[PDB]
Amino acid sequence: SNDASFNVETFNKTNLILQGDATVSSEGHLLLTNVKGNEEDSMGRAFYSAPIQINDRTIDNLASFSTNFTFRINAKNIENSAYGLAFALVPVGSRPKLKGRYLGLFNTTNYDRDAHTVAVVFDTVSNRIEIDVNSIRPIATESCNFGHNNGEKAEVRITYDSPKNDLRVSLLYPSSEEKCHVSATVPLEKEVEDWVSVGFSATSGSKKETTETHNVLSWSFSSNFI
Amino acid sequence: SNDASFNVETFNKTNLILQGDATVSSEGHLLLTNVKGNEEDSMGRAFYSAPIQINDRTIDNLASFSTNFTFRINAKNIENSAYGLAFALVPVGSRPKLKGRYLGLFNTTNYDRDAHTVAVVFDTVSNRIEIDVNSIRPIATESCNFGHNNGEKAEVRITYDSPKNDLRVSLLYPSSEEKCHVSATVPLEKEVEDWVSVGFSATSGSKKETTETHNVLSWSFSSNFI
Numbered sequence: 051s052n053d054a055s056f057n058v059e060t061f062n063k064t065n066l067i068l069q070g071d072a073t074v075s076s077e078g079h080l081l082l083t084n085v086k087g088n089e090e091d092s093m094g095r096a097f098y099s100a101p102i103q104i105n106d107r108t109i110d111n112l113a114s115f116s117t118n119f120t121f122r123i124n125a126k127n128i129e130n131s132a133y134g135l136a137f138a139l140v141p142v143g144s145r146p147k148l149k150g151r152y153l154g155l156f157n158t159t160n161y162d163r164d165a166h167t168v169a170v171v172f173d174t175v176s177n178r179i180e181i182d183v184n185s186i187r188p189i190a191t192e193s194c195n196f197g198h199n200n201g202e203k204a205e206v207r208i209t210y211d212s213p214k215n216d217l218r219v220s221l222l223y224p225s226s227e228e229k230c231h232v233s234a235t236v237p238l239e240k241e242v243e244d245w246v247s248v249g250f251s252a253t254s255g256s257k258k259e260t261t262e263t264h265n266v267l268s269w270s271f272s273s274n275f276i
Numbered sequence: 277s278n279d280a281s282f283n284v285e286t287f288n289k290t291n292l293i294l295q296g297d298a299t300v301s302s303e304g305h306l307l308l309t310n311v312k313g314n315e316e317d318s319m320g321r322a323f324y325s326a327p328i329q330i331n332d333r334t335i336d337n338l339a340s341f342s343t344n345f346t347f348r349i350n351a352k353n354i355e356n357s358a359y360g361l362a363f364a365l366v367p368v369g370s371r372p373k374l375k376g377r378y379l380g381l382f383n384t385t386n387y388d389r390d391a392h393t394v395a396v397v398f399d400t401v402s403n404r405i406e407i408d409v410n411s412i413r414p415i416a417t418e419s420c421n422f423g424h425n426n427g428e429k430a431e432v433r434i435t436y437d438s439p440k441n442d443l444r445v446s447l448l449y450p451s452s453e454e455k456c457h458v459s460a461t462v463p464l465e466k467e468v469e470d471w472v473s474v475g476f477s478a479t480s481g482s483k484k485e486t487t488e489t490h491n492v493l494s495w496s497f498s499s500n501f502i
């Protein structure tokens with residue numbers, strides 16, 4: 051097996067795979083979508099350059115992982131923004147999919163086993179944290195008012211306890227002290243490939259008034275077999 | 277800044293950049309040079325897929341790192357084998373250089389500041405551990421009888437303490453209980469690029485009787501800014 055961790059105190063494009071409109075600012079923040087110019091239908095993705103082993107066939111053992119990151123979404127109109135930001139596990143070498151509500155991660159509305167993608171979505175359209183497993187129809191959600199915290203930093207903690215197939219998400223907006231959480235049972239070994247690229251993806255609104263930016267400020271990840 | 281670590285208990289090509297004759301066996305071992313067929317002038321390199329940040333200019337701070345790995349060199353004729361195996365820090369995206377004594381890492385004998393390559397060489401020709409800094413003329417060496425331990429596993433520990441510019445190497449052959457060590461003062465930030473690829477390189481003898489294999493069995497690495 052292979053364990054791996056990284057702690058991104060400030061982003062640098064050198065160790066990332068940037069796709070779409072994703073860029074790293076001079077301040078070292080990950081800008082997933084356009085922050086200037088045409089933000090309509092802007093889409094970007096970014097993954098750590100090294101693949102992460104999730105399933106080691108030889109030991110019939112699965113890895114557990116933990117990832118913490120902070121982000122900030124800044125919308126034009128806090129009551130009509132879209133679409134959201136997502137943390138995702140995707141196939142190594144994969145290219146962006148559909149924009150809009152597909153978040154650049156999916157290309158069909160219904161379940162598609164061949165997608166091999168799991169994502170934790172911070173949906174600004176519905177104001178919910180959603181766990182999407184190979185489809186945009188969430189297997190679990192919980193309301194989380196992102197709009198009330200427009201332009202504020204959110205601290206997120208995601209853990210995957212493999213023995214229990216337990217994926218847990220906790221979010222906190224220190225400014226308002228709003229907390230959001232959601233968990234779901236997801237057998238990763240069946241839903242994603244043996245190795246995956248971990249990262250983020252985001253899509254901005256299709257019209258002038260529904261645009262918003264999606265920036266990740268810091269990010270640490272750790273996976274290990276046990 | 278960015279910290280990174282990984283623990284390779286069994287090798288897999290998915291998270292490696294393989295060059296030359298380097299391959300990963302079904303047993304999960306890294307075979308840097310040809311183990312079957314023509315081993316004459318075989319050369320191979322392998323690096324972790326994600327670049328490692330060494331110098332974060334914005335903070336006027338340098339990373340320290342620690343790396344442990346085990347290897348096995350197996351020569352046909354223990355008195356005439358060449359050339360060796362090396363742990364190296366090279367420029368991101370770099371391709372192999374010259375073979376033979378150059379180890380696939382260098383292309384000139386004298387110092388070349390533009391090489392931006394630092395290596396800890398387990399030299400089978402001279403039977404010494406050598407610290408090469410942008411040149412094959414080692415800045416420090418100590419005898420280490422690899423031949424007397426032909427085909428045996430060596431456990432190596434390398435640490436770089438940035439505040440002191442201290443690079444230390446410790447090797448142990450559990451089977452014979454022979455230990456080798458060598459240290460040197462190397463200001464990494466002045467000798468390598470801000471970001472580097474970490475890994476191995478090896479070259480096999482040019483003649484039938486001087487050939488040998490170079491296998492890495494396990495490897496863990498960790499770099500941290502402090």
Ligand SMILES: *[C@@H]1O[C@H](CO)[C@@H](O[C@@H]2O[C@H](CO)[C@@H](O)[C@H](O)[C@H]2NC(C)=O)[C@H](O)[C@H]1NC(C)=O
Nearest residue numbers: 061062063064074075076077078331333470471
């Ligand atoms: C990402 O890392 C690179 C390499 O350290 C940084 O680029 C260097 O920045 C310094 C100071 O601005 C320049 O003098 C060098 O010429 C740059 N080197 C290269 C290869 O571009 C870059 O600034 C870092 N990114 C961020 C956002 O900090």
Ligand SMILES: *[C@@H]1O[C@H](CO)[C@@H](O[C@@H]2O[C@H](CO)[C@@H](O)[C@H](O)[C@H]2NC(C)=O)[C@H](O)[C@H]1NC(C)=O
Nearest residue numbers: 105107244245287288289290300301302303304
């Ligand atoms: C490196 O990892 C890959 C992916 O897990 C391993 O390849 C799989 O091996 C199993 C068992 O042999 C096969 O059933 C799959 O079809 C393979 N998948 C792929 C994508 O190749 C590979 O064996 C691992 N390498 C080592 C040395 O263990």
Ligand SMILES: *[C@@H]1O[C@H](CO)[C@@H](O)[C@H](O)[C@H]1NC(C)=O
Nearest residue numbers: 145146147156157158164165
């Ligand atoms: C979705 O994307 C995958 C990979 O690009 C492709 O194989 C598949 O055919 C696509 N499906 C549709 C309906 O476009």
Ligand SMILES: *[C@@H]1O[C@H](CO)[C@@H](O)[C@H](O)[C@H]1NC(C)=O
Nearest residue numbers: 055116117118207270271272
């Ligand atoms: C995330 O934070 C929690 C608590 O602060 C910690 O236990 C965990 O190890 C962290 N994970 C990473 C990848 O930093």
Ligand SMILES: *[C@@H]1O[C@H](CO)[C@@H](O)[C@H](O)[C@H]1NC(C)=O
Nearest residue numbers: 373382383384385388390391
């Ligand atoms: C070594 O490689 C570099 C690659 O740019 C090249 O400029 C240099 O001339 C090479 N050395 C020799 C002696 O050719």
Ligand SMILES: *[C@@H]1O[C@H](CO)[C@@H](O)[C@H](O)[C@H]1NC(C)=O
Nearest residue numbers: 281342343344433496497498
């Ligand atoms: C290497 O091993 C030593 C002692 O076993 C340990 O202190 C160190 O943290 C290890 N480093 C890595 C990268 O595994």
